[PDB]
Amino acid sequence: PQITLWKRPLVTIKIGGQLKEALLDTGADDTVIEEMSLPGRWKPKMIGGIGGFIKVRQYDQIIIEIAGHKAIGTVLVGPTPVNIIGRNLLTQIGATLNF
Amino acid sequence: PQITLWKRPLVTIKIGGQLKEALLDTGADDTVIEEMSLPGRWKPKMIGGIGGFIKVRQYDQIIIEIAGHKAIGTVLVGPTPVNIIGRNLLTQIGATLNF
Numbered sequence A, B: 001p002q003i004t005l006w007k008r009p010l011v012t013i014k015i016g017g018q019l020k021e022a023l024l025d026t027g028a029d030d031t032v033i034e035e036m037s038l039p040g041r042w043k044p045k046m047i048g049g050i051g052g053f054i055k056v057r058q059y060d061q062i063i064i065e066i067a068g069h070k071a072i073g074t075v076l077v078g079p080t081p082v083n084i085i086g087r088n089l090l091t092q093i094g095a096t097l098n099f
């Protein structure tokens, strides 16, 4: 698909057996999901943006489905105000910015 | 152009006759720039990102070139960690997300 940017580019994802809405976010290095349980090991991380830093849990090798496309990668879990699909997973679904 | 996302989507902008680096950010509603001088009056705005909210100065109808494309629109100025081009100006330069 081609998604215009008149509105927030929100898509449905499947993660951990759960459907969620998330933002396709080219300004995010990493993917950050609101609090949920994921299987496996994790380690703490701090990530920063406007308004400062939050502490998240870093889970590696997590499979997500993004708008129907499967990917695998690291997912950060923590008190983000919105679910964000960042570049680490956008690249895997072949997403590009075009103008 | 077609910009892949293996690296940050950084481009050159020109505002106030000055070149700056900025991130093309589909996760940002608005364009936010580090402290600089702009002409005219400003209005207050509060914006919320990953770490909480910050106060910014909103300047409307500012001339800004983004990756060689001319735009004229709202620029927020404040303590952002990086210059961000948000959807208000991404739409002016015709950007879409594609996968």
Ligand SMILES: COc1ccc(S(=O)(=O)N(CC(C)C)C[C@@H](O)[C@H](Cc2ccccc2)NC(=O)O[C@H]2CCC[C@H]3O[C@@H]4OCC[C@@H]4[C@@H]23)cc1
Pocket: A025, A026, A027, A028, A029, A030, A031, A032, A047, A048, A049, A050, A081, A082, A084, A086, B025, B026, B027, B028, B029, B030, B031, B032, B047, B048, B049, B050, B051, B082, B084, B086
């Ligand atoms: C290491 O990996 C990551 C590190 C940081 C982030 S980030 O979420 O902080 N961020 C990085 C930017 C700031 C360099 C990604 C952004 O796209 C962020 C994504 C985002 C979206 C919503 C809530 C929080 C964060 N957008 C954002 O902060 O937007 C705010 C500034 C502009 C005006 C408003 O538009 C947005 O929509 C309305 C509110 C926000 C507000 C994500 C992954």
Ligand SMILES: [Cl-]
Pocket: A072, A073, A074, A088, A089
């Ligand atoms: Cl990854």
Ligand SMILES: [Cl-]
Pocket: A094, B004
């Ligand atoms: Cl590619």
Ligand code: NA
Pocket: A039, A040, A041, A059, A060, A061, A062
């Ligand atoms: Na893991």
